[PDB]
Structures are given as structure tokens and as C-alpha cells.
Symmetry: C2
Subunit: 331 residues, 2 copies
């Protein structure tokens, strides 16, 4: 007895974006009263001058819902037409149900496939690749993809090497079917023999500690930069090639905003010409993990650094170690 | 300027399975020293006579790895050929890196795409559909899918309406490219307006509580039953239809093992003939959430209740509410 399948038919494309950063502006000046560091060391080492933190009223569910509502309104779709929602996060601290289910309820989605994905800072790029595959194999038609984090809660203010890095926010995109390729092939993988490079504390350990609520982020920044400069840069070049273009065909490069030095060294490895606009939004954003790429897409489009129809290389890389990147056409 | 996508070819199929449950046998007799119930009542309500809990040395990482090692050995692949690992769980209580990354490191995987998926008890069927889509669109070739849970840590022994339900274990499967379809179209979705039916506590709440380590499961079982009988049964019928077969063409029916009465009403709604073997392994399994379906597949194959080449409808359903099911050919 044979099993019938749906065809692989057509492609997919971004239809719209939206973002909702944390509302609290934390300058390096204010940061240096919370940690022992200086504002010009921070800016020198990372390019960060300020970052956004969520207030106590901005949860990953409310930020994710806000970003998604903006994407929905801009897409011209009705909420009833969304039939998949994917949320990339490490900040949904409830085991079950998923943050996708909570956001689906706020939006009043109907019969939508709904799941959370944990791909660390690569999660939005992981989720984009999946959305494209789902649409092309007919298991979804309009996919809401959200990267959302609230890293301030897990930031170690006694760790001067990392306290100044992390920020809070959501970015969202709606992906739909397309006659022409709008999402190029994903180049993704992992380096799990390097797992100890970025590790968060486990919740049972935090829970037993009477002096803390949340687990803390730990990061070996020098190992991270070496990996980003060496191996991630090569995966980015592969993602461009798999899309059937050269670096000079790109209009914009939007890496995960981990460090200005990382962004710069990958740009040079790719030998990007002056015509390629490179995202340096880390300046007022810091590191928002899986929310980094979709926030930056939205904001670059908003300020005219990027335009509809531009080709953008997006790539995320983070704890695991994991990575994922692809070329997309901006909506 | 255009971009391209990877050449599409073929389908996918299960190559092997493996499973590893917790070693601690908790009979209904022992359960009724912990809660105010009787073994007769538990069995009449659910069909459970015993369940497995993990010992303190059995973690989701160690059980997940053991199940995966068994599946890997049975498949005839080298570990180095796995290029995606998907872990479906609500029991990985570390924000980052993912459980997929920890297990990838234990197995010595190389450059494999690696992510955790939260689809509640539907998680294995969600991950199966994604693996199939990934393979068919060329982003992976051999996908390791693991459903693993340690729900005993989140079981409320003061809640006699749920404490007898939950269990611990891992089930694993390796999925690979195929010339003919081994996995039918997914039928999946959610009913997020019913979210309040199953909610686990937030980790920050558990962390703040001086007398608690883990958050606890809360469940409205009778709302779950009404939903499973009336709505999930219809989705099960659709997944059979989508595969181009009738219920009589099935060899096996393997729903998520949540309640024997749920299994039976869905069987009768589908009008399964006598030749269809129905999984009722809840009898000594209990409810192992996303691990339920891959453990049942593996154990049914082991005891000769199911056979290589059988057509099986697998369906998962859980908190969200979410569901996912498909017809597969057993390895
Ligand atoms: K979670
Ligand atoms: K605590
Ligand atoms: K450090
Ligand atoms: K987790
Ligand atoms: K606690
Ligand atoms: K109850």
C-alpha cells in the first residue's frame, strides 16, 4: 500500500516585518553604575553605546505579540489566515505550553501549527528555513516567525565581561508562498564539541539558590570571536554561494549583532564591496540573541538602510555551538 | 537579481527506532501511598497500572542519548552521517544551549543542524513532519528525532487528579531520504483559545518558592477528554485521508498514550477494523508526553505487536492545545 504526499511546489517569501524592543533605554553611563566598567571600554570592545531592556510589564509574550501584530497589520492578511507560528527563544521560562501557543491565543489565531524552537542566537534563521520548507511542502501557507528574548533577567551584573552585552525585544516576520525564490537555502549546523563556550545555568540550580531567581549567562567571549571569525565566516560565504549569487550581489548583510568586531571581520572575509550595507545596529541595541536579526531587518527597513526587494544575507550563531544563515529578499 | 534553491528529490522514511525509559517502576500500589486514591480507580479512569520514573542519575540528556544510540546502531549509519538532530521536550530545564546540543556532543555528531522543539505531547509528530520536510527540500539527509521527558519532577503529588498520570523516558528515530514515501502529510494545528486546559507553572514562580524546586503540572483532564474525543479524532481521520488511504489500510494505530478511553473513542470514531492493532501501552507506560509515540513504536516493534513495513497512524496532542499526526511506514 502506497502513501501519498503533498507535492513540493513553489517557494516562499517574507511578506512583512515588525519589532517591539524593550522600552527602557540603558546607556553605558547608567550601565557603569550597575557594573564595574567604563562607557568607553564598552564602546571600544563592542560598539555598544546603549541597549534596550524590557520593563516588568514587557514579557516575552507581550513583546512577541506586539511585534507580530505589527507584522500582521503590514501584511494585509487576516489573523485567521495564519496557519503556523514559530517562536525562537531561550527566554520562555515556562515548560509548557509553548510561547507560540500563548502568542497564538493573544492574536486569536485559529487552527495554526504552533511550536517553540531553541536554536540559541541562531533561532530566527533556523525558524525561517523551517517556515520555507513547511510552505513549500504544503503543510502551511502563512507562517508567523518570531524571535524574542528577555536576556536582562539572565544577565550577570557581577560579570563585567558580559553584563554590558545583552538586551530584550522581539522581532517578527510573516512568510508566505511565492512564485519565485524569496528565501535561499539554509546553511546550518553545530559544533557541539565546543558546547562549553556558552552555557547558561540550569533552572534547578537557580531555583535552589535563595539569593537569585533566574539562571545566569556565561560566555567565553574570546572563544566566541575566534569561532565567529574562523568558521562562521565560512558558513556565511557558503550561504551566499548556495543562493546562487556573489557577495557583490547582496544589498545588505545582517548578522546576529554579537560584537562590532565580529561583524567587521566577517564582512572582510566575505570581501563585501562598498555597495553592501552592513548592519551595525548593536550600537543602540546590544545583543538580543534570537531576536537580533528580525529586529535589525525591521529597523533597517524602517530607517531606509534597506529597501523592499533587496537581497540580504541573514545569519545567526550562538550557544551549542549552533549556526544558521540564508539569503532572503526583503519585503 | 534572482536567488536559487536546492534541487528537490524524493521523500523520506523511518530507518530505525530506539527507546530508554526511566528505571524506577512505580506501581499503582506505590502511587496510592503517595496520593489519596486506589489502584482500581486509577486503572478504571486511565488504563494505567504502572509507570516508569527516572532515577536521579537518569537525566533527559542521558535517556535521550541512550535511545539515540540504540536507533543509531540499528540504522547502520555512522554518527558522522547524521546532519540534523531534533529534540522534542518540555523537560530541558536549562535555557541554553539546547538539549539537542548536549546529546549531539554525547554522540559525537559533527556538523549537524541542532534544535529543541516545544510541541508539548505533540512534539514528536511535529518533529517528524519537519524532518520529512527538511529532507525533501535538501537541508538535511539523515535526521535524528528524539522525544524525551522527565515529567515526574513536575508532577504534583498533592494533586490526586493528575499525580498518577506522568512518566519519564526517551524515544528516538532516525529518518532518511527515500525514493518512495515513508511519511505521509502532516495534519497539525492548535486550539490556543483552550490554552488554560493544561498549564505548567512558570520557572520564576518555582524558583522564588522556598519549598519547591520544579514547576508543577496542572491539567483539566475532562476538558482534555472532550477535546480529544471530538476534535483530535477528526484530525486523526484527516491524516489518514491525506495519506490517500482508508482506516482499513492501516496496520497499526499509535496515538500519544494519554488515556485508554481517549485511545478507544478515537479508534471507534475512525471505525478501525479488527485487523488494525491499537497501542494501549499506557497500561505500563503512563503519560510520557513527547516521548510517548516513539517509545510505543519501539516497544511494539520489539514485542512483535507491530512489524517492519506496517502502515501506522501516529498522532500527538497536548498542551496549547496543539496536535500533529501523520501516517508512517514502520522501519
Ligand atoms: K520553555
Ligand atoms: K531561587
Ligand atoms: K567571560
Ligand atoms: K529549555
Ligand atoms: K525554589
Ligand atoms: K485537575
Amino acid at each position: 500500500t502506497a502513501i501519498k504526499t503533498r507535492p513540493v511546489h513553489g517557494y516562499s517569501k517574507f511578506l512583512s516585518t515588525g519589532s517591539a524592543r524593550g522600552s527602557r533605554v540603558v546607556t553605558n553611563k547608567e550601565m557603569c553604575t550597575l557594573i564595574d566598567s567604563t562607557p568607553e571600554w564598552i564602546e571600544q570592545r563592542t560598539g555598544i553605546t546603549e541597549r534596550r531592556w524590557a520593563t516588568n510589564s514587557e514579557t516575552v509574550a507581550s513583546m512577541g505579540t506586539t511585534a507580530a501584530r505589527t507584522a500582521l497589520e503590514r501584511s494585509g492578511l487576516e489573523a485567521s489566515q495564519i496557519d503556523a507560528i514559530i517562536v525562537a527563544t531561550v527566554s520562555h521560562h515556562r515548560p509548557s505550553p509553548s510561547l507560540a501557543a500563548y502568542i497564538a491565543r493573544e492574536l486569536g489565531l485559529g487552527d495554526a501549527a504552533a511550536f517553540d524552537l531553541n536554536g540559541a542566537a541562531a533561532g530566527f534563521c533556523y525558524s525561517t528555513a523551517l517556515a520555507d520548507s513547511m510552505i513549500r511542502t504544503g503543510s502551511a501557507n502563512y507562517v508567523l516567525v518570531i524571535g524574542v528574548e528577555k536576556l536582562s533577567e539572565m544577565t550577570n551584573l557581577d560579570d563585567r565581561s558580559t553584563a554590558f552585552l545583552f538586551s530584550d525585544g522581539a522581532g517578527a516576520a510573516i512568510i508566505g508562498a511565492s512564485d519565485e525564490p524569496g528565501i535561499g537555502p539554509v546553511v546550518w549546523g553545530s559544533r557541539s564539541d565546543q558546547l562549553k563556550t556558552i552555557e547558561l545555568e540550569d533552572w534547578p540550580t537557580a531555583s535552589a539558590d535563595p539569593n537569585k531567581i533566574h539562571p545566569l549567562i556565561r560566555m567565553e567571549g574570546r572563544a566566541v570571536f575566534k569561532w565567529a571569525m574562523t568558521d562562521v565566516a565560512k558558513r556565511a560565504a557558503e550561504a551566499i554561494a548556495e543562493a546562487g549569487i556573489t557577495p557583490a550581489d547582496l544589498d545588505v548583510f545582517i548578522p546576529h549583532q554579537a560584537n562590532d568586531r565580529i561583524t567587521d571581520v566577517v564582512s572582510r572575509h566575505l570581501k563585501l564591496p562598498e555597495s553592501v550595507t552592513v548592519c551595525h545596529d548593536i550600537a543602540d541595541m546590544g545583543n538580543t540573541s534570537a531576536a537580533s536579526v528580525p529586529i535589525a531587518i525591521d529597523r533597517m527597513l524602517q530607517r531606509g538602510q534597506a529597501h523592499s526587494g533587496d537581497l540580504a544575507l541573514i545569519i545567526g550563531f550562538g550557544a551549542g555551538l549552533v549556526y544558521a544563515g540564508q539569503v532572503i529578499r526583503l519585503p
